[PDB]
PDB file of C-alpha atoms in Angstrom:
ATOM      1  CA  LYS X   1    -182.367-106.740 -55.859  1.00  0.00           C
ATOM      2  CA  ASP X   2    -182.827-110.577 -57.155  1.00  0.00           C
ATOM      3  CA  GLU X   3    -179.262-111.580 -55.479  1.00  0.00           C
ATOM      4  CA  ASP X   4    -176.895-109.274 -53.331  1.00  0.00           C
ATOM      5  CA  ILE X   5    -173.770-108.204 -55.531  1.00  0.00           C
ATOM      6  CA  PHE X   6    -170.462-107.291 -53.826  1.00  0.00           C
ATOM      7  CA  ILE X   7    -168.077-106.361 -55.825  1.00  0.00           C
ATOM      8  CA  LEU X   8    -164.252-104.700 -55.174  1.00  0.00           C
ATOM      9  CA  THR X   9    -162.159-102.413 -56.853  1.00  0.00           C
ATOM     10  CA  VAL X  10    -158.644-103.884 -56.524  1.00  0.00           C
ATOM     11  CA  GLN X  11    -155.228-102.326 -57.905  1.00  0.00           C
ATOM     12  CA  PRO X  12    -152.938-105.071 -57.565  1.00  0.00           C
ATOM     13  CA  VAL X  13    -148.979-104.373 -56.503  1.00  0.00           C
ATOM     14  CA  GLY X  14    -147.184-107.668 -57.311  1.00  0.00           C
ATOM     15  CA  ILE X  15    -146.788-111.086 -57.650  1.00  0.00           C
ATOM     16  CA  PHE X  16    -145.353-114.101 -55.484  1.00  0.00           C
ATOM     17  CA  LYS X  17    -143.302-116.666 -57.853  1.00  0.00           C
ATOM     18  CA  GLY X  18    -142.713-118.495 -55.714  1.00  0.00           C
ATOM     19  CA  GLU X  19    -142.347-118.600 -51.115  1.00  0.00           C
ATOM     20  CA  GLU X  20    -140.452-114.641 -52.912  1.00  0.00           C
ATOM     21  CA  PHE X  21    -141.559-111.791 -53.451  1.00  0.00           C
ATOM     22  CA  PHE X  22    -141.694-109.799 -57.262  1.00  0.00           C
ATOM     23  CA  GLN X  23    -142.843-106.135 -57.553  1.00  0.00           C
ATOM     24  CA  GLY X  24    -144.414-105.363 -60.957  1.00  0.00           C
ATOM     25  CA  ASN X  25    -147.445-104.878 -63.260  1.00  0.00           C
ATOM     26  CA  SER X  26    -149.504-105.638 -66.184  1.00  0.00           C
ATOM     27  CA  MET X  27    -150.499-109.060 -65.433  1.00  0.00           C
ATOM     28  CA  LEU X  28    -153.643-110.158 -65.344  1.00  0.00           C
ATOM     29  CA  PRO X  29    -155.224-112.925 -63.496  1.00  0.00           C
ATOM     30  CA  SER X  30    -158.155-115.056 -65.983  1.00  0.00           C
ATOM     31  CA  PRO X  31    -161.468-114.696 -64.045  1.00  0.00           C
ATOM     32  CA  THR X  32    -163.742-117.541 -61.232  1.00  0.00           C
ATOM     33  CA  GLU X  33    -159.020-117.888 -60.217  1.00  0.00           C
ATOM     34  CA  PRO X  34    -160.649-117.439 -56.671  1.00  0.00           C
ATOM     35  CA  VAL X  35    -159.879-114.723 -54.286  1.00  0.00           C
ATOM     36  CA  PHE X  36    -158.049-115.002 -50.642  1.00  0.00           C
ATOM     37  CA  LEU X  37    -156.791-113.046 -48.233  1.00  0.00           C
ATOM     38  CA  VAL X  38    -153.615-112.251 -47.034  1.00  0.00           C
ATOM     39  CA  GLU X  39    -151.969-113.297 -43.752  1.00  0.00           C
ATOM     40  CA  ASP X  40    -149.814-111.015 -41.489  1.00  0.00           C
ATOM     41  CA  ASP X  41    -146.858-112.652 -42.039  1.00  0.00           C
ATOM     42  CA  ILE X  42    -146.079-112.422 -45.923  1.00  0.00           C
ATOM     43  CA  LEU X  43    -147.376-108.911 -45.387  1.00  0.00           C
ATOM     44  CA  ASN X  44    -143.907-109.019 -42.954  1.00  0.00           C
ATOM     45  CA  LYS X  45    -141.835-110.062 -45.310  1.00  0.00           C
ATOM     46  CA  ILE X  46    -143.244-106.971 -47.702  1.00  0.00           C
ATOM     47  CA  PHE X  47    -141.626-103.972 -46.016  1.00  0.00           C
ATOM     48  CA  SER X  48    -138.918-105.637 -44.590  1.00  0.00           C
ATOM     49  CA  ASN X  49    -135.005-105.163 -45.384  1.00  0.00           C
ATOM     50  CA  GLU X  50    -131.779-107.503 -44.028  1.00  0.00           C
ATOM     51  CA  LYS X  51    -130.806-106.313 -41.335  1.00  0.00           C
ATOM     52  CA  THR X  52    -127.657-104.722 -41.940  1.00  0.00           C
ATOM     53  CA  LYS X  53    -129.968-101.775 -43.297  1.00  0.00           C
ATOM     54  CA  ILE X  54    -133.958-102.410 -41.135  1.00  0.00           C
ATOM     55  CA  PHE X  55    -134.556 -98.716 -40.334  1.00  0.00           C
ATOM     56  CA  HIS X  56    -138.151 -99.244 -38.572  1.00  0.00           C
ATOM     57  CA  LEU X  57    -140.651 -96.114 -39.265  1.00  0.00           C
ATOM     58  CA  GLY X  58    -143.600 -97.910 -36.841  1.00  0.00           C
TER      59      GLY X  58
ATOM     60  CA  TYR I   1    -119.673 -78.806 -87.779  1.00  0.00           C
ATOM     61  CA  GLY I   2    -120.046 -82.078 -86.079  1.00  0.00           C
ATOM     62  CA  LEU I   3    -121.722 -81.917 -82.576  1.00  0.00           C
ATOM     63  CA  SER I   4    -124.853 -83.904 -80.746  1.00  0.00           C
ATOM     64  CA  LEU I   5    -126.532 -84.206 -76.926  1.00  0.00           C
ATOM     65  CA  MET I   6    -127.179 -86.639 -74.974  1.00  0.00           C
ATOM     66  CA  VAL I   7    -129.222 -84.478 -72.933  1.00  0.00           C
ATOM     67  CA  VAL I   8    -129.690 -87.239 -69.550  1.00  0.00           C
ATOM     68  CA  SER I   9    -131.596 -86.042 -66.174  1.00  0.00           C
ATOM     69  CA  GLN I  10    -134.913 -87.509 -64.228  1.00  0.00           C
ATOM     70  CA  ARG I  11    -136.865 -84.321 -63.796  1.00  0.00           C
ATOM     71  CA  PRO I  12    -137.195 -83.606 -67.755  1.00  0.00           C
ATOM     72  CA  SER I  13    -139.909 -80.858 -66.817  1.00  0.00           C
ATOM     73  CA  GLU I  14    -136.677 -79.099 -65.004  1.00  0.00           C
ATOM     74  CA  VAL I  15    -134.589 -78.561 -68.252  1.00  0.00           C
ATOM     75  CA  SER I  16    -134.964 -75.687 -70.313  1.00  0.00           C
ATOM     76  CA  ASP I  17    -137.637 -76.885 -73.088  1.00  0.00           C
ATOM     77  CA  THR I  18    -135.459 -74.943 -76.103  1.00  0.00           C
ATOM     78  CA  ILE I  19    -132.602 -77.285 -75.783  1.00  0.00           C
ATOM     79  CA  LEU I  20    -135.430 -80.691 -75.047  1.00  0.00           C
ATOM     80  CA  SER I  21    -137.169 -79.582 -77.552  1.00  0.00           C
ATOM     81  CA  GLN I  22    -134.421 -79.862 -80.418  1.00  0.00           C
ATOM     82  CA  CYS I  23    -133.675 -83.807 -78.961  1.00  0.00           C
ATOM     83  CA  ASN I  24    -135.018 -86.102 -82.586  1.00  0.00           C
ATOM     84  CA  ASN I  25    -134.968 -89.779 -80.654  1.00  0.00           C
ATOM     85  CA  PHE I  26    -135.854 -90.569 -76.436  1.00  0.00           C
ATOM     86  CA  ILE I  27    -134.752 -93.436 -74.738  1.00  0.00           C
ATOM     87  CA  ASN I  28    -137.009 -92.740 -71.918  1.00  0.00           C
ATOM     88  CA  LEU I  29    -136.842 -95.159 -69.164  1.00  0.00           C
ATOM     89  CA  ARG I  30    -139.988 -95.267 -65.742  1.00  0.00           C
ATOM     90  CA  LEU I  31    -141.013 -92.091 -64.677  1.00  0.00           C
ATOM     91  CA  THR I  32    -143.598 -91.655 -62.031  1.00  0.00           C
ATOM     92  CA  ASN I  33    -143.697 -88.243 -61.941  1.00  0.00           C
ATOM     93  CA  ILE I  34    -146.974 -87.235 -63.117  1.00  0.00           C
ATOM     94  CA  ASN I  35    -145.903 -83.475 -64.131  1.00  0.00           C
ATOM     95  CA  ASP I  36    -142.427 -85.403 -65.632  1.00  0.00           C
ATOM     96  CA  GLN I  37    -144.900 -87.785 -68.106  1.00  0.00           C
ATOM     97  CA  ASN I  38    -147.335 -84.981 -69.706  1.00  0.00           C
ATOM     98  CA  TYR I  39    -143.955 -83.183 -70.005  1.00  0.00           C
ATOM     99  CA  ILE I  40    -142.313 -85.543 -71.663  1.00  0.00           C
ATOM    100  CA  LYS I  41    -145.800 -87.026 -73.992  1.00  0.00           C
ATOM    101  CA  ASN I  42    -146.358 -83.489 -75.609  1.00  0.00           C
ATOM    102  CA  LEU I  43    -142.835 -83.411 -76.813  1.00  0.00           C
ATOM    103  CA  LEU I  44    -142.638 -87.097 -78.856  1.00  0.00           C
ATOM    104  CA  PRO I  45    -143.935 -87.397 -81.890  1.00  0.00           C
ATOM    105  CA  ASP I  46    -148.040 -87.876 -82.453  1.00  0.00           C
ATOM    106  CA  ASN I  47    -147.414 -91.901 -83.767  1.00  0.00           C
ATOM    107  CA  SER I  48    -146.324 -92.548 -80.264  1.00  0.00           C
ATOM    108  CA  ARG I  49    -148.578 -90.706 -77.730  1.00  0.00           C
ATOM    109  CA  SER I  50    -150.983 -94.387 -77.431  1.00  0.00           C
ATOM    110  CA  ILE I  51    -147.587 -95.994 -77.354  1.00  0.00           C
ATOM    111  CA  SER I  52    -146.353 -93.414 -74.510  1.00  0.00           C
ATOM    112  CA  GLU I  53    -148.491 -94.506 -71.074  1.00  0.00           C
ATOM    113  CA  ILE I  54    -146.235 -97.232 -70.400  1.00  0.00           C
ATOM    114  CA  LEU I  55    -144.268 -95.374 -69.028  1.00  0.00           C
ATOM    115  CA  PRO I  56    -145.455 -95.739 -65.326  1.00  0.00           C
ATOM    116  CA  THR I  57    -145.353 -99.068 -65.973  1.00  0.00           C
ATOM    117  CA  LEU I  58    -141.541 -99.598 -67.417  1.00  0.00           C
ATOM    118  CA  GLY I  59    -139.795-102.197 -65.473  1.00  0.00           C
TER     119      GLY I  59
ATOM    120  CA  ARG P   1    -136.087-132.164 -60.803  1.00  0.00           C
ATOM    121  CA  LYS P   2    -139.284-130.195 -58.175  1.00  0.00           C
ATOM    122  CA  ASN P   3    -138.001-126.973 -60.039  1.00  0.00           C
ATOM    123  CA  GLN P   4    -137.836-128.381 -64.343  1.00  0.00           C
ATOM    124  CA  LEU P   5    -141.277-129.528 -63.493  1.00  0.00           C
ATOM    125  CA  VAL P   6    -143.130-126.473 -61.684  1.00  0.00           C
ATOM    126  CA  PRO P   7    -143.510-125.413 -65.130  1.00  0.00           C
ATOM    127  CA  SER P   8    -146.048-127.030 -67.245  1.00  0.00           C
ATOM    128  CA  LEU P   9    -147.968-127.528 -63.234  1.00  0.00           C
ATOM    129  CA  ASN P  10    -148.921-124.328 -63.344  1.00  0.00           C
ATOM    130  CA  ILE P  11    -151.339-123.719 -66.583  1.00  0.00           C
ATOM    131  CA  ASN P  12    -154.487-124.693 -65.735  1.00  0.00           C
ATOM    132  CA  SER P  13    -156.166-126.084 -68.703  1.00  0.00           C
ATOM    133  CA  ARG P  14    -154.265-129.086 -69.348  1.00  0.00           C
ATOM    134  CA  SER P  15    -154.418-132.657 -69.876  1.00  0.00           C
ATOM    135  CA  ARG P  16    -151.954-134.608 -67.191  1.00  0.00           C
ATOM    136  CA  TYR P  17    -151.750-138.642 -67.419  1.00  0.00           C
ATOM    137  CA  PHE P  18    -149.930-141.082 -65.071  1.00  0.00           C
ATOM    138  CA  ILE P  19    -148.586-144.381 -65.422  1.00  0.00           C
ATOM    139  CA  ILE P  20    -148.020-145.090 -61.735  1.00  0.00           C
ATOM    140  CA  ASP P  21    -146.600-148.861 -60.860  1.00  0.00           C
ATOM    141  CA  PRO P  22    -148.359-149.911 -57.751  1.00  0.00           C
ATOM    142  CA  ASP P  23    -145.643-152.396 -57.152  1.00  0.00           C
ATOM    143  CA  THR P  24    -142.330-149.063 -57.028  1.00  0.00           C
ATOM    144  CA  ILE P  25    -144.070-147.621 -54.643  1.00  0.00           C
ATOM    145  CA  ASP P  26    -144.247-148.897 -50.951  1.00  0.00           C
ATOM    146  CA  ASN P  27    -148.264-148.709 -49.142  1.00  0.00           C
ATOM    147  CA  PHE P  28    -149.467-147.960 -52.264  1.00  0.00           C
ATOM    148  CA  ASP P  29    -153.078-149.601 -51.441  1.00  0.00           C
ATOM    149  CA  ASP P  30    -153.428-147.434 -48.472  1.00  0.00           C
ATOM    150  CA  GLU P  31    -152.233-144.295 -49.531  1.00  0.00           C
ATOM    151  CA  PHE P  32    -152.586-143.852 -53.741  1.00  0.00           C
ATOM    152  CA  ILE P  33    -156.230-142.960 -52.451  1.00  0.00           C
ATOM    153  CA  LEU P  34    -155.551-139.465 -50.665  1.00  0.00           C
ATOM    154  CA  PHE P  35    -152.337-138.883 -53.174  1.00  0.00           C
ATOM    155  CA  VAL P  36    -155.578-138.767 -55.759  1.00  0.00           C
ATOM    156  CA  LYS P  37    -157.796-136.809 -53.413  1.00  0.00           C
ATOM    157  CA  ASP P  38    -154.875-134.103 -52.545  1.00  0.00           C
ATOM    158  CA  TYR P  39    -154.181-134.241 -56.457  1.00  0.00           C
ATOM    159  CA  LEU P  40    -157.804-133.095 -57.422  1.00  0.00           C
ATOM    160  CA  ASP P  41    -157.757-130.714 -54.871  1.00  0.00           C
ATOM    161  CA  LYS P  42    -154.621-128.916 -56.159  1.00  0.00           C
ATOM    162  CA  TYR P  43    -155.557-128.761 -59.818  1.00  0.00           C
ATOM    163  CA  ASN P  44    -158.668-130.093 -60.474  1.00  0.00           C
ATOM    164  CA  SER P  45    -160.650-128.094 -58.441  1.00  0.00           C
ATOM    165  CA  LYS P  46    -162.051-124.839 -59.750  1.00  0.00           C
ATOM    166  CA  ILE P  47    -165.391-125.449 -62.717  1.00  0.00           C
ATOM    167  CA  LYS P  48    -164.642-123.366 -64.902  1.00  0.00           C
ATOM    168  CA  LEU P  49    -160.750-123.447 -65.195  1.00  0.00           C
ATOM    169  CA  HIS P  50    -159.053-126.676 -65.320  1.00  0.00           C
ATOM    170  CA  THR P  51    -161.324-128.890 -68.023  1.00  0.00           C
ATOM    171  CA  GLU P  52    -158.957-131.049 -68.467  1.00  0.00           C
ATOM    172  CA  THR P  53    -159.116-134.947 -66.391  1.00  0.00           C
ATOM    173  CA  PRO P  54    -156.145-136.123 -65.196  1.00  0.00           C
ATOM    174  CA  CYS P  55    -156.177-140.304 -66.311  1.00  0.00           C
ATOM    175  CA  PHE P  56    -154.439-142.786 -64.085  1.00  0.00           C
ATOM    176  CA  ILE P  57    -153.137-146.103 -65.087  1.00  0.00           C
ATOM    177  CA  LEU P  58    -152.089-148.259 -62.868  1.00  0.00           C
ATOM    178  CA  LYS P  59    -150.130-151.334 -63.997  1.00  0.00           C
ATOM    179  CA  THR P  60    -152.438-154.240 -62.688  1.00  0.00           C
ATOM    180  CA  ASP P  61    -154.994-157.163 -63.310  1.00  0.00           C
ATOM    181  CA  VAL P  62    -158.531-156.346 -64.287  1.00  0.00           C
ATOM    182  CA  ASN P  63    -159.748-157.609 -61.013  1.00  0.00           C
ATOM    183  CA  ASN P  64    -158.108-155.324 -59.175  1.00  0.00           C
ATOM    184  CA  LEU P  65    -159.346-152.623 -59.994  1.00  0.00           C
ATOM    185  CA  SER P  66    -162.934-152.087 -58.047  1.00  0.00           C
ATOM    186  CA  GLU P  67    -161.181-152.642 -55.184  1.00  0.00           C
ATOM    187  CA  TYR P  68    -159.804-149.386 -55.946  1.00  0.00           C
ATOM    188  CA  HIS P  69    -162.543-148.271 -57.061  1.00  0.00           C
ATOM    189  CA  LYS P  70    -164.985-149.155 -53.910  1.00  0.00           C
ATOM    190  CA  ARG P  71    -162.550-147.438 -51.338  1.00  0.00           C
ATOM    191  CA  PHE P  72    -162.963-144.299 -54.065  1.00  0.00           C
ATOM    192  CA  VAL P  73    -167.357-144.445 -53.545  1.00  0.00           C
ATOM    193  CA  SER P  74    -166.210-144.558 -50.165  1.00  0.00           C
ATOM    194  CA  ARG P  75    -164.237-141.413 -49.750  1.00  0.00           C
ATOM    195  CA  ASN P  76    -166.700-139.545 -51.798  1.00  0.00           C
ATOM    196  CA  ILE P  77    -164.614-139.297 -54.820  1.00  0.00           C
ATOM    197  CA  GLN P  78    -166.753-139.360 -58.244  1.00  0.00           C
ATOM    198  CA  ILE P  79    -164.236-141.256 -61.270  1.00  0.00           C
ATOM    199  CA  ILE P  80    -164.618-143.749 -64.530  1.00  0.00           C
ATOM    200  CA  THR P  81    -163.104-146.842 -64.448  1.00  0.00           C
ATOM    201  CA  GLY P  82    -164.453-148.174 -68.476  1.00  0.00           C
ATOM    202  CA  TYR P  83    -164.969-151.936 -67.314  1.00  0.00           C
ATOM    203  CA  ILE P  84    -168.219-152.883 -66.063  1.00  0.00           C
ATOM    204  CA  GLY P  85    -166.643-156.291 -64.647  1.00  0.00           C
ATOM    205  CA  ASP P  86    -164.241-157.948 -66.974  1.00  0.00           C
ATOM    206  CA  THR P  87    -165.225-156.213 -70.148  1.00  0.00           C
ATOM    207  CA  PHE P  88    -163.536-152.510 -71.495  1.00  0.00           C
ATOM    208  CA  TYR P  89    -166.431-150.259 -73.866  1.00  0.00           C
ATOM    209  CA  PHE P  90    -164.355-147.336 -75.405  1.00  0.00           C
ATOM    210  CA  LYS P  91    -167.412-144.768 -74.867  1.00  0.00           C
ATOM    211  CA  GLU P  92    -167.459-144.441 -71.174  1.00  0.00           C
ATOM    212  CA  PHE P  93    -163.838-144.171 -71.005  1.00  0.00           C
ATOM    213  CA  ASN P  94    -163.736-141.388 -73.539  1.00  0.00           C
ATOM    214  CA  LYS P  95    -166.444-139.456 -72.253  1.00  0.00           C
ATOM    215  CA  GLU P  96    -166.736-135.752 -71.593  1.00  0.00           C
ATOM    216  CA  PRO P  97    -167.892-135.576 -67.797  1.00  0.00           C
ATOM    217  CA  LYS P  98    -170.773-132.983 -68.110  1.00  0.00           C
ATOM    218  CA  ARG P  99    -170.357-130.402 -65.711  1.00  0.00           C
ATOM    219  CA  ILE P 100    -173.331-127.369 -64.058  1.00  0.00           C
ATOM    220  CA  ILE P 101    -171.203-124.374 -63.002  1.00  0.00           C
ATOM    221  CA  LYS P 102    -174.110-123.365 -61.014  1.00  0.00           C
ATOM    222  CA  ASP P 103    -173.159-125.782 -57.648  1.00  0.00           C
ATOM    223  CA  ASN P 104    -170.095-127.087 -58.816  1.00  0.00           C
ATOM    224  CA  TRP P 105    -171.086-130.614 -60.292  1.00  0.00           C
ATOM    225  CA  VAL P 106    -168.679-132.192 -61.948  1.00  0.00           C
ATOM    226  CA  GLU P 107    -169.577-136.374 -63.044  1.00  0.00           C
ATOM    227  CA  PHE P 108    -166.516-137.330 -62.969  1.00  0.00           C
ATOM    228  CA  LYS P 109    -162.658-136.039 -61.038  1.00  0.00           C
ATOM    229  CA  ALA P 110    -160.189-138.674 -62.792  1.00  0.00           C
ATOM    230  CA  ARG P 111    -160.097-141.670 -64.735  1.00  0.00           C
ATOM    231  CA  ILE P 112    -158.560-144.749 -62.894  1.00  0.00           C
ATOM    232  CA  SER P 113    -158.223-147.871 -65.268  1.00  0.00           C
ATOM    233  CA  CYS P 114    -155.588-150.905 -65.363  1.00  0.00           C
ATOM    234  CA  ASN P 115    -153.061-151.711 -68.076  1.00  0.00           C
ATOM    235  CA  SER P 116    -154.489-153.155 -70.796  1.00  0.00           C
ATOM    236  CA  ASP P 117    -154.604-152.936 -74.001  1.00  0.00           C
ATOM    237  CA  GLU P 118    -157.822-151.334 -74.414  1.00  0.00           C
ATOM    238  CA  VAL P 119    -157.093-148.271 -72.714  1.00  0.00           C
ATOM    239  CA  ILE P 120    -153.833-147.856 -73.490  1.00  0.00           C
ATOM    240  CA  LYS P 121    -155.685-147.721 -77.031  1.00  0.00           C
ATOM    241  CA  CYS P 122    -158.742-145.169 -75.666  1.00  0.00           C
ATOM    242  CA  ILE P 123    -155.033-143.373 -73.960  1.00  0.00           C
ATOM    243  CA  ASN P 124    -153.636-143.303 -77.881  1.00  0.00           C
ATOM    244  CA  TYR P 125    -157.324-142.050 -79.402  1.00  0.00           C
ATOM    245  CA  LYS P 126    -157.041-138.561 -77.707  1.00  0.00           C
ATOM    246  CA  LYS P 127    -153.826-137.984 -76.663  1.00  0.00           C
ATOM    247  CA  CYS P 128    -152.253-135.870 -73.376  1.00  0.00           C
ATOM    248  CA  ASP P 129    -149.735-132.942 -73.268  1.00  0.00           C
ATOM    249  CA  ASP P 130    -147.513-134.536 -70.461  1.00  0.00           C
ATOM    250  CA  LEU P 131    -147.527-138.123 -69.313  1.00  0.00           C
ATOM    251  CA  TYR P 132    -145.000-139.729 -66.926  1.00  0.00           C
ATOM    252  CA  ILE P 133    -144.104-142.447 -65.687  1.00  0.00           C
ATOM    253  CA  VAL P 134    -143.458-144.052 -61.739  1.00  0.00           C
ATOM    254  CA  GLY P 135    -141.949-146.802 -61.544  1.00  0.00           C
ATOM    255  CA  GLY P 136    -140.232-147.301 -64.897  1.00  0.00           C
ATOM    256  CA  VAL P 137    -143.076-149.493 -66.474  1.00  0.00           C
ATOM    257  CA  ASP P 138    -143.098-150.423 -69.907  1.00  0.00           C
ATOM    258  CA  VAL P 139    -143.972-147.196 -71.941  1.00  0.00           C
ATOM    259  CA  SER P 140    -144.130-148.530 -75.843  1.00  0.00           C
ATOM    260  CA  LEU P 141    -147.025-148.635 -77.669  1.00  0.00           C
ATOM    261  CA  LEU P 142    -148.297-144.519 -76.934  1.00  0.00           C
ATOM    262  CA  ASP P 143    -147.335-142.477 -79.279  1.00  0.00           C
ATOM    263  CA  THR P 144    -145.092-141.288 -76.950  1.00  0.00           C
ATOM    264  CA  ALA P 145    -145.199-138.481 -79.769  1.00  0.00           C
ATOM    265  CA  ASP P 146    -146.443-135.513 -78.644  1.00  0.00           C
ATOM    266  CA  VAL P 147    -146.406-135.685 -75.483  1.00  0.00           C
ATOM    267  CA  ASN P 148    -143.667-134.435 -72.623  1.00  0.00           C
ATOM    268  CA  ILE P 149    -143.084-137.748 -71.663  1.00  0.00           C
ATOM    269  CA  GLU P 150    -141.233-137.903 -67.931  1.00  0.00           C
ATOM    270  CA  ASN P 151    -139.664-140.301 -66.622  1.00  0.00           C
ATOM    271  CA  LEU P 152    -140.445-140.477 -62.218  1.00  0.00           C
ATOM    272  CA  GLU P 153    -137.874-141.671 -60.150  1.00  0.00           C
ATOM    273  CA  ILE P 154    -139.192-142.055 -56.747  1.00  0.00           C
ATOM    274  CA  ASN P 155    -140.276-144.329 -53.759  1.00  0.00           C
ATOM    275  CA  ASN P 156    -142.870-143.549 -52.204  1.00  0.00           C
ATOM    276  CA  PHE P 157    -145.976-140.971 -52.100  1.00  0.00           C
ATOM    277  CA  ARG P 158    -144.101-137.935 -50.073  1.00  0.00           C
ATOM    278  CA  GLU P 159    -141.747-137.371 -53.041  1.00  0.00           C
ATOM    279  CA  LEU P 160    -144.398-137.686 -55.926  1.00  0.00           C
ATOM    280  CA  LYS P 161    -145.814-135.119 -53.536  1.00  0.00           C
ATOM    281  CA  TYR P 162    -142.770-132.564 -53.298  1.00  0.00           C
ATOM    282  CA  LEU P 163    -142.138-132.833 -56.990  1.00  0.00           C
ATOM    283  CA  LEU P 164    -145.457-132.165 -58.102  1.00  0.00           C
ATOM    284  CA  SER P 165    -145.379-129.367 -55.265  1.00  0.00           C
ATOM    285  CA  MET P 166    -148.030-130.218 -53.480  1.00  0.00           C
ATOM    286  CA  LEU P 167    -145.776-130.153 -50.729  1.00  0.00           C
ATOM    287  CA  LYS P 168    -142.640-127.646 -50.074  1.00  0.00           C
ATOM    288  CA  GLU P 169    -140.625-130.884 -47.782  1.00  0.00           C
ATOM    289  CA  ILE P 170    -140.717-133.855 -48.083  1.00  0.00           C
TER     290      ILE P 170
END
């Protein structure tokens, strides 16, 4: 009541080492680390494959 | 008489329990079926039940 | 070279010291402040996870450092020199900045000083973990036995930014 508490319970689904994706888990980010919202262009490199085996479902 | 079995299956719940329950050593890889983890957890030794929660996490 | 240094730069709490030589890098006077600003905006940014203050040591006269301090003050960057004018106070150079984590306040961001004997002794008193040398400065009396010495050969600040993973291209 004195302040406003907005909390999100969120689940990891991977990691970006650098300029690339690496599916995995068991990675614990240290507290106070900043949290951003992902852009759609980054999400497009995920759910995508090589052009020789791309099948657009929707 | 000198025979051994290596039961290799991706669906442990579908294999007959008469053959799997006679296995002493387990080499468990990643399992994603909740009906498969439950069956293999009850077949592992009791000391490894605490560490048997890594099966969906192994990569 | 960039991928060799990408470890020890991903660690938040880690002391990094620089021995940048103004003569080697061109346009040093007009780009050093911006380079420090973009370094602090990425490395000395978080107030709870970045608990180490970077130290920058320049090979120049003690008089020329006041101009750098004035430029930093004008660009609204809080740094400590340790010099009150031709006089060095070691009790001020080796002080931990005061942090108040309620409004994102820290007393100072970086330590920019000269290459005198007093500042060298102060650095030796509280050794860092990674020591970076730019321009081939005579790093002899630093007791570099514990630190990870990493000489860097560059010609402009763009290459320095690329090496420190602050840029994707040159």
